[PDB]
Every structure is written in C-alpha cells, then in structure tokens.
Amino acid sequence: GAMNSSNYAELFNNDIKLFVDDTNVYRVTVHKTFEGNVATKAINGCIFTLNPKTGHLFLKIIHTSVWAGQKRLSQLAKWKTAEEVSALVRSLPKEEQPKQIIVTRKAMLDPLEVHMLDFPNIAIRPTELRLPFSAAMSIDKLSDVVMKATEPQMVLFNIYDDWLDRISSYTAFSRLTLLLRALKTNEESAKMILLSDPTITIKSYHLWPSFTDEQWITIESQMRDLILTEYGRKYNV
C-alpha cells in the first residue's frame, strides 16, 4: 500500500523501484495581457523519475511544444507523465524494470495504473511522505538542461554523484532529501551554504560539490539549522 515512515527501509532493498514526481512537468509563468487580463505562458518541464537505491535519475524533459493546442493541461500533465514513465519501463530490459513505482502525488495513481496495465506485476504505490523532489529544479545543472532543451529529451543523471562509494543508499537518500528540503524551504540560503567555500568544486560529471566526509557533516548540520530556522521564521517559534 502507501509508502510511509514505517516501511521506509524498503526503498533500499534489492527490489528495483522508482519514485515518480510530476510537480515540474507542467510549469507556467502567469502574466498580464495587453487588455489587462491574465494568461499563462508554459516553460519547459521535466518528470523526476528516480531509483532511490542506485541514484539513477531518468530526467524526462517536457518541451512546451507538447502543450500546443491542448486543453486541461494540469490534467494532461499527469497522463503525459504516465505515458512517459510507461515508455521508460518498456525501453528497459526486463531485469531492469521496476517491481514498484511510487508516485509522490496521488493524482498520478490512476494515470499511471492505466498506462501500466500491460505490466500487472508492477505495483503502483502512493506515499504519505511529503518528499521534496519539486526542489529538483533548484539543482543548477538539472534546471539548465531543462531550460535549454529545444525538443523532448531524456537525460540520465546519478543524483548521488559518487556518494555510494563511501555511504549507503539509505544515507545517500537521507542526504539528498535534506538537501532538497533545504532548497525548497529557502533556496537562496540553501545555495549559499553549498558554495560558500569556492575551493570545494562540482566535478563536471556531478551535480553537488565534492565534499569530504567531514565537510558533508558540516553541510548537513547547516541544512538542518536552515530547515529548523525557516520553520521558526515561518511559525514564529
């Protein structure tokens, strides 16, 4: 059933699973028209599909051309997401197809289920977790490839860089979600934190700075402080 804090370790077992997040699939800027009305202008988006065990991210890029002439786009976006997830599954060799897919928003359950009818042995699950994958467009290189895209495009990332050489997937995942939670609550601060020390660079093939173990500990604590603070600054506590 639903994924929550109690079955949290199941992410890191040896059953293939992907998270899907659709929050960045349909993106608009809202503006005033010359007549003084409001119109939306869509910008490129992405589906954030992610194997929490390996860190492989299947960033499907959603070019605004896909919304051309379409109605009820917030709804189409969930079916378009499900179409793309399903095409991704079909393209993987059998032994790489997930046994589960966990959607971060319950509205995606029925669209994915319908598209996945050909894969009855794949469980489509919701979660009770309030995960921060929406903040994934606060990762600069991810934001970059999405905004530059000129056609639909799939780009493959490892969202853990090389962390797994040194830490467990459980711990990788916790770091990642601490980074994304920080990015979501206060992006400016979160980013200041990650790059304050210009000597700690991001390898061209990575998304995050190459911190040492001790430098990650310092970082993680600063992101924690950030999240507790922005919660106080928000609720006055």
């Binding site: 029925d110 289920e113 319908v114 598209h115 009818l117 050909d118």
Partner: protein, 300 residues
C-alpha cells in the same frame, strides 16, 4: 393470470412476491399466490421468521411452465419446483382456489411499478447470469457472489454478470489511455453494447436484474454491478439519446421503489454524485435527479 401454489407453509416466513410481501405463520393454511400477471418475470422470495439471515428466492416466468413451492425440511427452505403434469397442476390449484387458501397478487390497476422495474428483464438472460439449466426458474440469495467477486469461490453458485472493470485492457485501447478512461464511450458502445450485450435492451435488462437482486436480497455484488453499469453510461460522452431517456426512466423507478430505510447500504454516494453532478450525463437524468434530491438529499 397465473398461479404459484404451495404444498403448505411449515415454518413461519415472510413471503415476497415482486414488490409485495405478507407474513405467514408457522403451519398457517397457506397454499400459494394467485392472479400473478402474465407477461412479466417475477421473483418470489423468503425471509424465515427465525433467521433473518439469508433472504432467498426464485426468478420465474409463468409462461415457461407450472411452478409450485414445497418446503424442504432437510435443506430447510422453500423450494421452487416445476410440475410437468399440467392436468395435475390445473386440478390441484383449482382445489385451493375453491377453498380460497391463496393470496391475490395485489396489483392496483394504475400501477406500472413492476413493469417499469422489469421492462428489459427476460428469463432467458437471467438464466445465463444464474447458471442452473435443469430448472426453468433461477435461485438467488443474499450471499451469492459474482463472477468478478471470485476473481478478487464456488463457480456453480455464482452470479455470472458481465464483468465491467474501468482499469482493464478491455476498457482502455492502447494509445487512447487518457481518452478512453475519462470518456468511456468506446467501452460502452463498441466493447459492451456492440460487442457483449448486442443492444441497449440486454444491457438495461442486466442492469435492472442487478438492482432487483440488490434490493430484494441485499446481494452486495449485484449492487456493485448495478452501480457499475450506470457509471459506464454516465461516464461516456456519447450515448444514444434514446438510451439516456430510458435510463432516466429506469433509475427513476428503481429509486422510487427502494425502501427508504435501505438507501444507506444500497446506494453508492460516489457513483451517484458523480453521475448526477460530474459526468457527461449530469444534465441528462432529470427525473432520476429530481427524485433523488427530494427523497435522499442527505446522500448528496
């Protein structure tokens, strides 16, 4: 007019005939039901005074033979039987009609209720849903499950209703996944109407049969089937105008006939609010909507 005679009434039971019912005391001199209108199916149904568990009953049509009820004390129930010897049956019944030991099917003449609830129900189709082909009549009760309920256990005692499943490959064409799921017109018209049911009358007959088994026996899967067949129609943008008109009539009488005290188990809040207010056909069921809002405004 025809007759369903009884050997006796050895246990205390409430007997239903169609939408009518009366109390019979243990070993009361009761010998059957007379003046049953020809031309319709009928259901004669039973709730023992001791064990309100298990309503049961028989769908039948008097044109398809002479049919009596004889209580069976081994199996403990009122059993429908067929008498092949017509002479014997005409004589025995005239005997009981002379001694006036039969209740009269109490049809008021202005009243088209039964016809309206059974318009498209035909015995021949009931017998395919309720497979027991040695008998011209069909046994149903409260606990019988449906062919779809068994997928999710005894197949001989099942209700073989048409399997409808909105998240199935049958319902969803590859390539129109969103289109066919939000607008089931493909499923309704091509798969079901043209493919499985053949016409709207067989479809409506199953839908009506399913309500009645829901209402008279509280058969849960029959209500599931009834709500599903409504929803398929209501969730389809393209429905022949004549089917929309007939469905408004069909449901109107089902809601009219439903016991006011049973609405909470037999009426699915979700399907009805969706049908009357969200679906393509939200504007196409005026009589159904008017009666639902004046009788059961609570559900909505």
């Amino acid at each position: 007019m025809n007759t369903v005679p009884f050997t006796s009434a050895p246990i205390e039971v409430t007997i239903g005939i169609d939408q009518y019912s009366f109390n019979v005391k243990e070993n009361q001199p009761f010998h059957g039901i007379k003046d049953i209108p020809i031309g319709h199916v009928h259901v004669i149904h039973f709730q023992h005074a001791d064990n309100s568990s298990m309503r049961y009953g028989y769908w039948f049509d008097c044109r398809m033979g002479n049919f009596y009820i004889q209580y069976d004390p081994k199996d403990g129930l009122y059993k429908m039987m067929e008498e092949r010897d017509g002479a014997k049956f005409e004589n025995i019944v005239h005997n009981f009609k002379e001694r006036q030991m039969m209740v009269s099917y109490p049809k008021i003449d202005e009243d088209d209720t039964w016809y309206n609830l059974t318009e498209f129900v035909q015995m021949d189709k009931i017998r395919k849903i309720v497979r027991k082909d040695e008998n011209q009549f069909s046994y149903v009760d409260s606990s019988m499950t449906t062919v779809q309920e068994n997928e999710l256990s005894d197949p001989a005692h099942s209700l073989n209703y048409t399997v409808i499943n909105f998240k199935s490959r049958e319902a969803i064409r590859p390539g129109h996944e969103m289109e066919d799921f939000l607008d089931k017109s493909y499923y309704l018209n091509t798969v079901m109407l043209q493919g499985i049911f053949k016409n709207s009358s067989n479809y409506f007959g199953e839908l009506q049969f399913a309500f009645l088994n829901a209402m008279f026996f509280g058969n849960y899967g029959s209500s599931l089937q009834w709500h599903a067949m409504i929803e398929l129609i209501c969730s389809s943008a393209t429905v022949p105008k004549h089917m929309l008109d007939k469905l408004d009539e069909i449901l109107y009488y089902q809601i009219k006939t439903l016991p006011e005290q049973y609405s909470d188990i037999l009426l699915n809040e979700r399907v009805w609010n969706i049908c009357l207010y969200s679906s393509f056909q939200k504007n196409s069921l005026h009589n159904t909507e008017k009666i639902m809002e004046n009788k059961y405004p609570e559900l909505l």
